[PDB]
Symmetry: D2
């Protein structure tokens, strides 16, 4: 089924994880420029990541095309698109052509320049026939809207997610307003992605939801937060924290943190539930297992976890076996293991 049909059919769409961060850790991406050349340099590495996400329950394979626009090549987009489709066809998933904020917009290159960059990328996805489009990682509504108006042209479903928190985009536009302007432009799915942990992200989504309601408008809700806890981030997101991007390890969410996220996202009415930087395959599976009752099945990766925490029953040690209760893991306040370190830092 398609994306709007799935959603409308009352289904829960599970997104895929954070590619650049995941690939960076496996040795195929360079932190800093965070570019997707691995699609052509090392396709097997990209293909395997897609499969792990697919095996974890993702219903979407986003094209590894983050920062794959020009003035930042076209062979990459195409190669990425192929791998994504190549992998999607292996299960119940759709390919999603994605575009992000652009340098051209940042360097103040008026409004006719950027859309050309967007269209420049939209072209490959159309010739590749992707199932729908995502305008993600946008800190400015105006550029977000411009990207939407460009992608709707393809006549396909377009999702738009803002990299903003409860306080608004860089120009001061609250999330409620951002959601409206985004829907008034064509997006049938609106959400938030990156910059903040699941908790803060859902607060953002709640505000967008209420903004739409007060606008008598409607659209599917989507969320792809960081898998890193960020109680210390200011409105600028995790990038401003001292540990970005090489000391974020201690902040990584456990699978239990993500199941809680999925449950709250569902309760909020979010139906496209994914993740961004920090999300590894097991985090996506966490979304899948937690909402198994609401969906109707379990993903293939659950064959290596399945038993909710009860997998420890096959443990050779007694103490580990006592932790085979699901409420044990969901009530446990895990230790950081770094007593000589602080629990929060101040944004730069």
């Amino acid at each position: 089924k398609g994306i709007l049909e799935r959603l409308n059919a009352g289904e829960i769409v599970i997104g895929d994880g954070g590619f650049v961060f995941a690939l960076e850790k496996r040795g195929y991406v360079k932190a800093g420029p965070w570019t997707p050349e691995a699609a052509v340099e090392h396709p097997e590495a990209v293909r395997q990541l897609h499969r792990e996400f697919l095996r974890a329950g993702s219903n979407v394979m986003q094209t590894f095309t983050f920062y794959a626009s020009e003035d930042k090549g076209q062979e990459v987009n195409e190669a990425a698109a192929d791998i994504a489709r190549q992998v999607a066809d292996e299960g119940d998933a759709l390919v999603a052509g994605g575009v992000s904020q652009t340098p051209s917009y940042l360097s103040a290159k008026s409004e006719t320049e950027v859309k050309k960059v967007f269209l420049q990328q939209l072209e490959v996805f159309m010739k590749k026939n992707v199932d729908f489009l995502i305008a993600e990682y946008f800190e400015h509504v105006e550029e977000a809207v411009w990207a939407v108006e460009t992608l709707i042209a393809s006549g396909k479903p377009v999702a738009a997610t803002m990299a903003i928190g409860p306080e608004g985009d860089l120009h001061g536009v609250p999330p409620g307003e951002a959601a409206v302007r985004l829907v008034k432009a064509g997006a049938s799915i609106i959400g938030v992605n990156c910059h903040f942990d699941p908790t803060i992200s859902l607060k953002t989504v709640k505000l967008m939801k209420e903004g739409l309601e007060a606008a008598q408008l409607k659209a599917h809700l989507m969320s792809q937060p960081l898998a890193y806890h960020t109680p210390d981030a200011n409105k600028q997101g995790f990038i401003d924290l001292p540990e970005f991007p090489f000391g974020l390890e201690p902040r990584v969410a456990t699978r239990w943190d993500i199941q809680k996220y999925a449950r709250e996202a569902y309760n909020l009415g979010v139906r496209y539930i994914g993740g961004c930087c920090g999300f590894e395959p097991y985090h996506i599976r966490a979304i899948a297992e937690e909402l198994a009752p609401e969906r109707g099945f379990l993903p293939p990766a659950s064959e290596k976890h399945g038993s909710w925490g009860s997998g420890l029953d096959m443990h050779t040690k007694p103490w580990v076996r006592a932790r085979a209760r699901k409420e044990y893991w969901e009530n446990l306040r895990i230790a950081s293991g770094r007593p000589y370190n602080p629990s929060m830092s101040k944004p730069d």
Copy 2:
């Protein structure tokens, strides 16, 4: 160049990471049993991980045979062939000794595996993850009886094995049983691990015995662990996330290991490709080259020097990441827990 060759020549041999923890995360292993059944069910998954480690700088592709005892050895062989790497057949403590069971039954389990590595001709062997010096000894005795060099590492800390046997004595009895390479693996973080290796190294020296040192610690900080290691921590094995070492923690470990005289420097549970790469980069001057994966990195954050924000560009340097006391991001959580 075999394992003993490189070592004797005074070379630094980089090990691979922790396969079962890594694959569990990716969806191919089951936490609890921790079996390598994926070696036949999803070879490309096991193959890709091997390749990532190879690309990160590993000189050893340990056969995905922790526990159990099939096509794993082949995969390991195929990837080692793609670079400067050797295949290692490994055997871990048996659940047989777990349920006690004499010396006969144990060496039976081991022998079956050795014949396999015997048939696929591995470069050397690894008596791995042993909590009792005695069971580790029997393993070594069976392995040496194949001609291939044998490495033996204990899953014990400064207090010794689960029988009260000190690390120094433990090491002694390991070498006296034919071990050319000894050390530690798993159970404790890099810091506690090197304390243990130091003890072993001192017990060896006190006995006029010589042997190459090896270390494959957890990539998890465990200042709160007791003599039983991290499995006893309440967070094992599903809430260990916060404890994972940064690439900088690993570079510090690599230097220290090197300064201690360790030349078989690897990692265990928790170690992902970038961690191995950290070893290779930290010791790049010594070894004289950078691993392939370094083309996708920067020295101590160098890769960030072109980022848009000033304070992020400011992080493109050694002086920054090695002094940064990173935040846990969990103010409502404790920093340590009590074993059990």
Copy 3:
């Protein structure tokens, strides 16, 4: 020199600490009721505390009359007479407004106390610990009707009073009701407190109104508190120990308060004599003198320069204590809690 004199002359008036929390610790007050009944039961206890604050540098001996409404005023008078100090008659929010009860009943409670301070001739008055701008207003209205200068501080943070009234507006209505000195006291740590004072100061300025600023924050760090303050924290009031500010935290607060334009610098719950002394020492250059208690101290650890151990002597300096991120000593505990 009266309270308004010193202030108008641009002098820095140092307040005293938190009597009820201090006495509770010493065994003279009851946590829960927090009544000043000790003023008649154990005068020397109340007297000694006043003296310690006076010796630490306080220029105001607030009458031990928080809640209730006797011999307290005398004690306060006697100690102020022993130094450069004034007596302050204080009245706090009534449990009457708590149980609602009109404007008549409340001003009745206040009036009884004002007559007392009226009869013992206090230097000035303090409308203290008010969570609602309205009830604080009535208090001020009754107090100004005595001729003595009136100071009014709210037990609210940046989000305003428990009715939704912003700090700026709250301050406005306080001055418009006769308050010559306004500010905040209790509920939040020094940092959140000065954020609140800044708001008040901005609401005052926006209204072309002028008045001396005052601050008496908790000596407890409360980064986790919500708009209701520390009473809502799970640790209130018996597990607050870890949150207590060091003398260095207080010196930082004192400087910041001063830079903000606050000239009535004091403290509330948690403030012990050495905390007050920290205010006096940090601002010693400005004020031009050190309090008597400074003969038993050293600037930024100077007093340790003769200690036997090297690393302790090393701590005899500013550059050390102001940069030191002190450990909690409780690794099995969280660093923040959730209100309720």
Copy 4:
């Protein structure tokens, strides 16, 4: 009753708190030299502290004579002694003449010099007729023993407490041995004081106890630990921690931590239960209330606390009232309130 009679009568002797630290905070003592001149300069300040401890349940008023020996005056000792007796006579307490380690011993001034300093102080206590003697704050057994042999001369009861942890004194003598040599010399009460928190302190006392048992010897057990948590201290004690002595605030024990300490001390067989640096009057009262059932009564300060945590019942706020349960406070993992700070530091 006397000290050995009290103890022998199955009674629990409650010590007094940490004077120099308490006085330092109130403005009468100078951190660094930590000397007791306040006895003469400001007696009312000293007298009031003694009373607070007496009111909290202390059965002993130690003479504010720490670092009051010569080459570090005699009027101070006498003045202190008077205040202590002056206050003791106000209740069920004894006066205890105390002596600590000496500079003379540190500067290697042989064995005949030091005892003279000790005797030089013993003289005032005898002429003042103190109830018994305490040789406290000793990091070297040998000097501890020398002080004992000198104080027993007075024919009075002598208690000896070591400022050492589970690992032994500065010369490497384990606690077990230290306890023997201490009893073989005259002390009828042996213990530990200062340097470590209550938990580590009791571990030290357990080792001294077992040492005595293995020596077929016996003596009353005593403990006066710091009221500061020190899980990060090495065998040198809290002095080597970066925060000594001006940044120790966050480590201060709550009254609940101390009640747990008192209970465990009692269970270990300790009968002289006190405290050292960090202990304020409410900490001593905590010892008193916790062992009320084993003693038979409550101290006078309990009239301002009494109800075990149930004092919140008279609180004007609901939430506070819900914390009037004793098990609430004893299970609560209190927050440090400093998320930007570490939980442990490394000894210098």
